[PDB]
């Protein structure tokens, strides 16, 4: 389970973000699961170039 | 194309080793050969020999 070396050596490339829908979570707020899904689906492509 | 006659000068170094052996002779013989403890007994000269 030795990843600290792997990560500490792999981050030499500055950055690149292909997509973000696959590695991001979020804490919802109240008033959920009827219009909340609507607020989600409206910008679903906004996460996937 | 044509080629010219090429030369080359090179030198090479030596390698240096050693050798050794062991010849430890006793103390009684050391004494008796020198005769420092040789007493004029007909039995001592035999030990010298």
């Amino acid at each position: 389970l030795d990843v600290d070396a792997t990560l500490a050596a792999l981050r030499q490339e500055p950055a690149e973000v292909q997509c973000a829908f696959g590695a991001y979570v979020a804490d919802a707020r109240p008033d959920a699961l009827v219009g909340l899904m609507q607020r989600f689906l409206e910008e679903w492509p906004g996460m996937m170039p | 194309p044509a080629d010219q006659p090429v030369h080359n000068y090179m030198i090479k170094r030596l390698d240096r080793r050693s050798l050794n052996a062991a010849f430890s002779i006793a103390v009684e013989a050391l004494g008796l050969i020198s005769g420092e403890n040789l007493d004029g007994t007909h039995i001592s000269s035999a030990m010298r020999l």
Binding site: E16, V17, Q18, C19, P49 | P1
Partner: protein, 296 residues
Amino acid sequence: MEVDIALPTLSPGDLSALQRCEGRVVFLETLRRHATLREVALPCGGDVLAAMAAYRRRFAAVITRVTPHRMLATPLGVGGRGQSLVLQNTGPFDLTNGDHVCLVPPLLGDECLRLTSANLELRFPMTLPLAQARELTARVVARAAETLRGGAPARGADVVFSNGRRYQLPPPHRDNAEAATRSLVLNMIFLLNEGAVILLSLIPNLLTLGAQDGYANAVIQLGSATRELGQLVRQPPPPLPQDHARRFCVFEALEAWIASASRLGDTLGTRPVARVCIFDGPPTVPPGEKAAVVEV
């Protein structure tokens, strides 16, 4: 450093024609004291851009006297003290005394030796004074461009003077002028448009300044010291994640444009190869007649 060329014996009659080209230039490959005629040969119907690019990776050399056995050449690049030598002018118009010659492919209608006995062809590049050549290239390219957009196909002003006489600039369909020059006009017009687009993309508000008081002021300020009107180049918008099918990084495009423009500028000649220093002769050599020259 004079090279000779083995000559695979052809025939009578044709060898006279080979003797007539005792003054032109030929592009060798490497400086060896021997070479076969099969080596210095080019399909006389060829692409002008590629030939003009290849003229750099070779050496110029002029054909001195020829014999049924061999023919002698003298390279121009390397040399000692720049000795004199004779040259047969073969451009479309004459060249005066005291100027510089340049080597361009047969841009207009072509002439090429067809040595039917040996089954090979030869191209002998034109010999033009510097400025007249730099303008003739633009002439042919601009005519092709005007034709491209299907506009008014003629304007009666595709003519070039040289020492009085008017030259006609033969019609652009004779040998393959509609095919062996397409490459050049495409590769030039495209780069010009790309440079313009890149500039306008870096400075979006250039063509919305004062018609006579803003643009001139911007140019004069840019030519002068570091004011630069701030970042006269506004910060371009941020690009896409380089996998989106519509990514456009302007600066890499500028990089590619710089590279391609430099390369195209170098593969155009316009760097003199010789200079006419005629002496004891008629001061103006007409086409087809030899002319004393000293290499530069």
